[PDB]
């Protein structure tokens, strides 16, 4: 009971101070991210076959792992993709909830098992098994305006002095060096080689022999002759270092390497380059750690940057062309200011409505307590301060201050119209509202929790909001039972000080009472208009575009350039430079970087990414959406290749609204051409159908490949061994490695490779003569036939079946399940041996996303049971439960007046307003029943209860509305989400208060007259 | 112990064997140590038979290990699928009498197959570092693997003492059998 | 962290005391005895 606490107020004070101490001790120890982990744990295997047709890599380095990687702990689905450049990556997504680490080790064990069947090169290159964080933490770039250091010098200095040093930093996961350390590049020349009668094996063995480390040996190594005293670790030195040293190796009369091969200090590989403001420079792509925060780690990396900025040589300069931490910090700090403004607005309206500060120090002293508690529980449950949880708190503040308001207001009303002492008045008020508050706690839980069990990323999104607000309202009501009684018993002083607002209030209350009477004279037309509102609510709810986490202006945007399938880097460089020159004329573009040769859809020589960032919102003259549209339009012309700019994704796997991702896979070994033709047929049959919106593929189009048929007959005739021809080809253009060599105190590499000027055209392959057995040497042309063909370069596997990705989003008037079954029906027409399988979000929306109706049913049942137990009557609960359409009415009317979508934020605000409306209705009908139990006529008992409940309802309503109004008028960074949550909650509040105040007593009269 | 977390215990075993994975013979290491939370009895025993005898047991064998096992392991619930039948494989039944008759050793046949069936990879002509003026880059390729009995039987083989260049079909019956003939299956007396 | 363990422990005892005897003076009188115990403790340690 609350009476006890009242008599022992210092007890409650302590119950509060303990919560306070725990919260102030718990806040600084909480991970501070923007959005929590939503994607399932994707263990990403990576393998590289340096220089092989994608079709060979798939059939040789992916089929094995495919046949073996399976049955591991809770593996949900595993996909694989082999690109042009010879890289095959396999994303295995496990069952939700599982741990990435243990399962990753499992995958490691499985991979270790198939290490033999793997070709030699793959084995020597290793099979990476990362944890797959798809978010680049930050780009640390290094440019030099003075041009004293070129692109290669810059990359060397980065990979030497900085990369290994950035990794020695708390929170860094992976540091992609988009460069390479200087390496002893040896460009051989096949013409002079053949002329000398040599071969690439000759030069390789010459290096590996004339350059080799030697095991040291320790003079006196035990056992030693009895007597020996002084030992010494005799070293040995056997790898050439200087350019000249390498340029003087006699192969087979004596012939120096400089005679047959040029030698220079190039790089390990020229895969990636980096343009920045036009200036060629280098960069390093930081990759957050799988399980760390974001803002703290990135700020620590910036500190590490400011530390390394001192020893930076002359000419160089550091830069951060992409940084996500400041936006995260601004968002969180923005939400926190919203909490503070909401609390101060509650304080203000409380002073306005209760006439003195003695009453305002009640919800201002209790609300923080509750919030503090929530923080503690968030720690003890593994949560993390983020926009989700913080929006939950700011959405819960209304309910919290509502309970506080109810208590204090009732204590005041009693203290004014009874002439009681604050202690006795509070005692009486708690006697009358001790139980309804418990019913409130139960119904709140029954509308919050049973909506926290849906599966999927969206399920986790919900879980955050739900668990945070539920723990907050539980603490709020527990406080309302423990502390507030003590507050209203001790802190409150007898009301004596009289402010011309009293007249206005009494006057409008009497007007409402008369109006109410006039309304309950027409219960049946009231019911009519109520069903009209319910229908209008259902209409807006079923005929509105549903979305997920709408877009925003994060300050930057990613422009991906995808050239044809046979283009060269230079082409890509031309496109990126044209894009850069197009963006030069804007004032909003602050920094513009471009990774020439990398791509989130796989690496290559025809793919580029440009992370263009804009200035802060303070000094902008356009929005990121307008800028991206301008970029797209300006790109669609004047250049070539699909170069499109795209806004950052709100959350992982949450960019396109309901863009179901399907995989058309084979099941009868139909072969790639048949599968491709069937997919084109399905794409046609889908473009021809309604209820769709731009069905499109995801794999690159076909590619021009070159198949070199080797005439064995001619080989055995002329006598050359097949091995010789094979080796000549594989060593004609393959970036072969040999061993290490010391230079500048580092162990750099020495790579042998045919000089680029002699391995570009196809005709050059013909100059690759080979010594024949008949005393002559034959050109490779007379034995190989180059046959062109068009084969798919992008190879894809899904659940061990050759598959093709197909993504699409449904139009208006179409739900998600309708589009799913529409696609199902469309694929069931395809020829035999062609199955389908959804994936990721699309998949979740089929397996366990028909639970929303089930969950809502569970919630409604529990709400009915709780109310029924609260009133011991099977008729009253329906009165309160009928308050849903009002709250929704407000939400929809608001969502329409601004044009937002039915996004998850709108739904959680809907839950918050539904809860508050149920609260209002509960208290109204409870006081009505109480007055009805004392012989007072229901016709006037209900009216009197409403007349009494008017002040707290308007009080709490105005408080919450004014407190969330910033979320509605917010401007600046991250204001989008603020809007998507404030418009809904604001309209909901408006309709809830203005409609419930009238309908809830009308509902009570209707129900109690119905029996 | 009964009721112990099988996952963490499997992890413990993985850790303990890690400390012993560097001492095992090289073959053992490069053959893998498959550590799995196991079971004793088969849940069920899926099989494929051929009542019309249109397919020999070897043909039925490959089908299950090339279009079933991989697709049956994904079923929620399938922990392991042990295939009592081996995938098809090009078998070279050499004849040591003829091997000696020409002067060769099985090591030689092994080298001839490894060389006339070599795997090549040219990469992609026009790869970085590109030359001033490169706007095309077709990913060329080389094919050096045999796919049919005809190509395997005609594999050259230098004759050690005499000089005659013989084919593989001279010293070895080349045919397609199963990888390993370890297990067989009798379903109701019929081979399957 | 020897200061926070004595700062937090002392505060916990004070809070519990105030809850138990519904006053702010009684827990002060109870807390005022801690330095005497620490006094002897320090005396014993220095002497030994």
CSV table of C-alpha atoms in Angstrom, one decimal, chain A residues 34-35 331-332 334-336 338-339 385-398 464-465 468-469 549 905 908-909 912 960 964 967 970 973-982 985:
chain,number,residue,atom,x,y,z
A,34,UNK,CA,23.0,5.4,-33.2
A,35,UNK,CA,21.1,2.3,-34.3
A,331,UNK,CA,21.6,13.1,-33.2
A,332,UNK,CA,22.0,11.8,-29.6
A,334,UNK,CA,19.6,16.5,-30.2
A,335,UNK,CA,17.3,13.9,-28.6
A,336,UNK,CA,18.7,14.7,-25.2
A,338,UNK,CA,14.4,17.2,-26.7
A,339,UNK,CA,14.1,15.3,-23.4
A,385,UNK,CA,21.9,4.3,-25.7
A,386,UNK,CA,20.7,5.0,-29.2
A,387,UNK,CA,18.1,7.0,-31.1
A,388,UNK,CA,15.7,4.0,-30.6
A,389,UNK,CA,15.9,3.8,-26.8
A,390,UNK,CA,16.1,7.6,-26.4
A,391,UNK,CA,13.1,8.1,-28.6
A,392,UNK,CA,11.4,5.5,-26.4
A,393,UNK,CA,12.2,7.5,-23.3
A,394,UNK,CA,11.0,10.8,-24.9
A,395,UNK,CA,7.9,8.9,-26.0
A,396,UNK,CA,7.5,7.5,-22.4
A,397,UNK,CA,8.0,10.9,-20.7
A,398,UNK,CA,4.4,11.7,-21.4
A,464,UNK,CA,14.3,-1.8,-28.3
A,465,UNK,CA,11.4,0.7,-28.1
A,468,UNK,CA,12.8,0.6,-22.9
A,469,UNK,CA,9.3,2.2,-22.6
A,549,UNK,CA,12.7,3.9,-41.3
A,905,UNK,CA,8.3,5.0,-35.9
A,908,UNK,CA,5.5,3.0,-32.0
A,909,UNK,CA,4.1,6.5,-31.6
A,912,UNK,CA,2.4,5.3,-27.1
A,960,UNK,CA,2.9,15.9,-23.8
A,964,UNK,CA,6.7,16.6,-28.5
A,967,UNK,CA,9.8,16.7,-32.7
A,970,UNK,CA,12.5,20.0,-35.7
A,973,UNK,CA,20.3,16.9,-39.0
A,974,UNK,CA,18.3,13.7,-38.3
A,975,UNK,CA,15.1,15.8,-38.2
A,976,UNK,CA,13.4,13.3,-40.5
A,977,UNK,CA,13.1,10.6,-37.9
A,978,UNK,CA,12.0,13.3,-35.4
A,979,UNK,CA,9.2,14.2,-37.7
A,980,UNK,CA,8.2,10.6,-38.4
A,981,UNK,CA,7.7,10.2,-34.7
A,982,UNK,CA,6.3,13.6,-33.7
A,985,UNK,CA,2.2,11.2,-31.7
